[model samples]
Every structure is written in structure tokens, then in C-alpha cells.
Target: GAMDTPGPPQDLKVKEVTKTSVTLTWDPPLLDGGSKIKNYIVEKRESTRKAYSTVATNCHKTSWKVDQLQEGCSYYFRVLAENEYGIGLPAETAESVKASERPLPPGKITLMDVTRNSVSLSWEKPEHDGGSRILGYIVEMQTKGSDKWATCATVKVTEATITGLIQGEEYSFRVSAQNEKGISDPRQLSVPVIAKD
Candidate 1:
């Protein structure tokens, strides 16, 4: 009956990975070594290295968001339980994970039709769909020389029609792809077009 270090954290897994970060979650150790657990230590290292870097030492929860990681680099992560005695064995990822981001923006946008008060545009699918299905696209419009943009429409297909433009005014359009993770950067129209027939 003396207290000792806790067991390794259980079920360590990655919940999310983005352009610059990864979120990890785990369950408490199966045995707390006869003492109450106090904190969790999270650590990571490049997949090619044996030296691990500490990400957090005072983590009190079972889930954590680790930020500022380099994109495209694969990493291994682990968590250890800490208690009154000391740090315990770590629970680690079975496979290294690569940092990634949302889909690249939709491909080149081209004018399909134009009228005094409206315009239609179409674009190709994004070269990289962020490893997920393209859920939809968000279309934004801005008048020439103005930094402001208004959401013109959100469509499930690669084409959209933006109505209610001012006659003779020049406007630019942009399209962004959307997936379950998030929206990608926008692909803009190369040259502003006049909203005149």
C-alpha cells in the first residue's frame, strides 16, 4: 500500500490534424498506482528521430490541441500520466501522422455568361480535394477597387450564377471549395469583368 507512479495513458489517438496542428485524445491509465492522477504530459517528435519534444507538462485534460507544427512533416505523439510520485510510462501513436490542411481552392474560374445585372461562372475541380469529397463551393463577389466582398452564393456544383450586379460596374469573382474539415482559399477571376451586356 504505498503510492507509486501511474500506468501509461490508454487509447492514445489523433482526433484532428490541420495545416499547423494536431489534436490528440486519450483515456486515463487503467491503473493509477494507488494515487490520484494529477496531470498528463504530451510530447511529439519527427518520425525519423528518437528524441521527443515536450509539448505540454501541465495538461489536466485527456484531450489537447498541439499547435505550430510544420505542415507535411510526419510526427509521432505520446502521453504520459503524472501523479504525486512522478511521470509514468507513455501511451504512443502506432503510426506517424502527417500535418495537412483543407482542400486547395477550386480551379480556374471562367466567365460563362454576363448581362447588365448578372453573371455566370464555372470552374474545374480543385487539384487536391484535401483527401475528402468536395461538399460544395462558396462564391464571393466584389466590385472593382473595393476591398469588400459579399457572399454571392453557395452551390454544390462547379458552376454558379451571381445576380444583382450594378450595370457597367466591374466586378471580380472568387470560388472556394468546401469539405467536412473546412473551406479552402479562394481561386479568383484573373481579370475583373464589366457587368454590361
Candidate 2:
């Protein structure tokens, strides 16, 4: 028997969820609807809103990350199977789910080597992520026992070197993670490093 109505999309899974976004992964339908699968369109809507937004289209993979979501709100999502002929119809929408509160970026400041002129420090990233990609981290440094800290350098790498220090002066260092949303709270080091003469 030729099945006219397309079979339901299979194996929908939420890979990750955050305050501002949700990442989903799913498997394609078994039946091709008489053509090669073109893409899948993802749709989302707030629990309170009547209309759903077309979040993404032409997504090649079975996985998708939907961003710019409202924090602390309940939302729903659905995927439609499409091909060269056009979008057939939507599979079963995901169950209504609540978005989690934005997680504070990871923090825990620790100094490794305390040199007279330079200091090496390290810290942990935010444990609670907002479901977005982390771009990089920001390093800040200042003189010892000083209230003001200035930007030392910005590096994609987790660690960095602080240069231009006096041989015998004390300095403090700190680091924070930054993403598309904003910079996290600075993780401060307990001890200062004095450069060697």
C-alpha cells in the first residue's frame, strides 16, 4: 500500500537547554515523500503566546540550537519535515517545557606561580551555561593593593601572560568569561605576585 500521508519525524531530543536558548537533536523520517530530504524547519512559541515563531529552516543536520529565547518562561517547539516538493507537515511538537534561569558563569580564582615581576593565574569557567557558545575569556590586572584593575589582555586561550611589570612591585590579577550575552563577574586572586629583581 502506498502511504500518502508522511510518517512522523522520529527521535526528537533536546541536547541542551538554557535561559536564553535550546539546542535540539532529532532523526529524519524514514519515508522520503518521493524525493530527497531538503531540510527541516524548527518552530518555537512561548506558552503564553498563541503564535509560534519559525526559528530555523534549511537545517542540514538533525541537530539545531535555537537562541534568543526568553528567560524563565515556558516554551514549546516542533519540527516540520520538508523536501523539494515543499514542507509536508509538522511532526508531533515537543512537550511544553520551562526555560531555566540563566546560570552564573563558572568562577573560582587561583594563582599558580607568583614571580616578582609577573604572575601566572588560573580559574574555572562558569558551571551554569546559558546554552550559547562561549567565545573566549578576558584577563584583567592591576597593581598590588590597588582598587582599580585594568584590562591586561583578551585571549581565546584560557590562560595568558601579564607583561610590563616592575621587577619588585606587587600586582593582582583576575579573569572572567565573555559570550554574546555579556561578561561574567570577575574571579579575583587571593595573593599578589612581585616581580624578581
Candidate 3:
């Protein structure tokens, strides 16, 4: 061909990511490959597949805003440069991004295997994990005569063992799931249980 191939774009990054849109930015290729750059291109890719589709063609700038992205979903993206030789290589984001949202709490706290000095508790995980891996759970307790709760444990598993209790006291238990972002709302026991031997 008469035209030289353009160089790949570089320093691609995502900014202002939201449920419905993402703004992308980049630096133009270091070398134009013997031709003046005619235009630029922007595109997006889903984490599920290798396919990428154009957001804008003949973009004419180093940045573009991609729209209509689904909420709570993750995606990777890239940019390209064009010249008289047509399109060249791609420069892509190093990691995927999810639509930002709050983490969800664990559900349905259940008390089991109760004893004078200890009790076992478990729960179902949230239907949605707020687009992140659940890091752990927090267990809290309130005595029958008290309005405040105290942390019994922070645990990785779905279940916790609470010990060192008053044998004749009524105890209320609550649990919450957590991600790296934050902790969730507490799920409390249906009824306070009295500790016994």
C-alpha cells in the first residue's frame, strides 16, 4: 500500500465510570509512521468475550465517552489510531471496571447449637455482592437489657462461633457481610436466646 501503518495508541485509561457511561482517555501514538494522523477511534469490550466494538470512529480527539453501559457490570476497553494506511494496533486498559455500587449485607441470621458459654450462628449470603468479592462477615451481640451491640468476631466463613457469654442472659445477635469497599447492614436474630448449659 502507498500509505504507512499508524502506531498503536498508548496510556489508555477510564475516568468517570458510571452505570450508564464511561469516559476514556489516552495519549496519541509516539510515532505517526510517516503519515499525519487522520483520525482516532474508541472502543469497548465486555469481560465475558474477546469482541470489541467501536464507540466512536473518526473521533478526532484523544478521549471519548462511551454510553449505554449496563449497571453493575464490568468491562475492559481500548483505543486505536488511524491514518492514510487505515487503522493500526490497539492500546487497552490494564484492568476491568464495574459500575460503582454499595456492598450488600448478609441475610437471614440463624442461631444454632446454643450452650451456656457459647453459640453457633450462620447466615445466607446476599443476593448481590455489590460487584465485589465478599471479604468476610462481622458478628455483633446485644444483651437483653442493653441497647447497644458489640462485635463478637470478624470472620471469613459464613458461620461464626460466639463464646464467653452469661449463662442466664438473653442475647441478641446480628451479622453483616463485607467487601473491600465497606460493610453491609446487619441481619438480626428473630428472637433473643437465653444462654443455658
Candidate 4:
């Protein structure tokens, strides 16, 4: 490694994914050559295309969001670091991704039939499908006072029966719709609710 060539980024990966967008992220280069890192170069390639096209540049942040992607299309992404010396080697995806335009998340998620140990949750379907038919829904929940969210269930229907809840604990729930393309962003409850009958 020359003292003038900046090292490439490391561990480039997708942090968040949606039907129309994917947010790519990476760790900054371990070495910035002799100069301070200036920026990053992000690129994308379609599944059927052999050439990679620059999608973003002059990005000082560690993350870049790629948007307006076609539904059900496959893509590969890469990132390179740059300094005054030169553009470094790229950190690239070894495999392609099939990111789809996801359907809309469920709305008006409600809790009903509350019991000591379980609750039934329901939601209305989203008005838009993001170019695909809704195939299923996913239910996620986080206990109050905890930052971790866990998947409670996934169903082909819009409603789910959540069980094994602690009677006195508080909980928040989120629901998302899934289609053939991808899963939509989650819709959260207005607030956390007490788990009681």
C-alpha cells in the first residue's frame, strides 16, 4: 500500500431496505493515506447490466441512500474512498440483491380482545401496493423501556394473535405489509399500551 493511495471502505452493506429504496452503509477506510479522507463514491449496477454506474459521489457520510429503484429488480452496489492522493479500491457486494418495491404497510393498527396473556391485533390494508399485490403481513413488538423490537408473527392475513405477554408490562406494536416484491416500512402504534385483560 502506497502512502498516497487511500484505503477502500470496509464491510459495505445495506442497512435499511424498502420497495423503492435501499440505504447502503460502510465503515470508513482504516487508512486515509497521508491526507484526510475527502469523500466516497457509490455506484450501482443492474442485474442484467454489466457496467456499473455512479449513483452518488462526494458523500462525506458513511451511508448513502439509493432511491427510485425499480420493483423486483436485482442490483449490486459498491463504495470507494478518496483522498487528495487517489481513489482507493472499492468495497463491493459479492452477490447481487433482489430488492423489490414493497407494498404499503398496514395502517390503524389496533389492539383488541386483550387478555391477561395475549391480545389480538388488527390493521387496515394500505391504499397503495407499490406495484405488487399484498401477500402477507408482519407483526413486530417492543416492550416498553426496551429498545429492542422483535418479530411476533407473520401472517397471510391482516390480523394476528399475539401471545405470551406479561400482564403488567407495557408494549408497543408495529405492522408492515408484504408483497411478492418486498416488505414495506413498519407502521407503529400511536403509543405503547399496558398489557392487561
How good is model 2 by TM-score? 0.50
* lDDT tens digits by residue: candidate 4, 24-132: 9899988888788889999998789989999988998999999878866778999999888879888998887666557777888887667777878888998788766
Give the clashing pairs for model 4.
19-101, 19-102
| lDDT of each residue in 16-70, candidate 2, tens digit only | 7777778888888878777777788888888999898898887888888888887
Model 2: residues with Cα > 4 Å off, grouped in runs:
1-6, 101-197
Q: What is candidate 3's TM-score against the reference? A: 0.56
RMSD of each candidate relative to the true structure:
6.7, 10.5, 6.1, 7.4
Point out the worst 10-residue segment of candidate 4 by lDDT.
96-105
Error of 2 at 152 (Å): 40
Predict model 2's lDDT versus the native.
0.73
Question: Taking the tens digit of each residue's C-alpha lDDT, what string does model 3 give over 26-69?
Answer: 88898777888888888888788778888888898888888888
Best by TM-score: 1
lDDT, residue 59, model 4: 91
Per-residue lDDT for 88-118 in model 1, tens only? 8889999988776679999899999999999
Candidate-wise lDDT, in order = 0.90, 0.73, 0.83, 0.84
Between 2 and 3, whose TM-score is larger? 3
Q: lDDT at 129 for candidate 4?
A: 81
Rank candidates, lDDT, best first.
Answer: 1, 4, 3, 2
List TM-scores for all candidates, in order: 0.61, 0.50, 0.56, 0.56
Worst 10 residues of 2 by lDDT: 1-10
Output the better candidate (1/3) by TM-score. Answer: 1
Query: What TM-score quantifies how close candidate 1 is to the native fold?
Result: 0.61
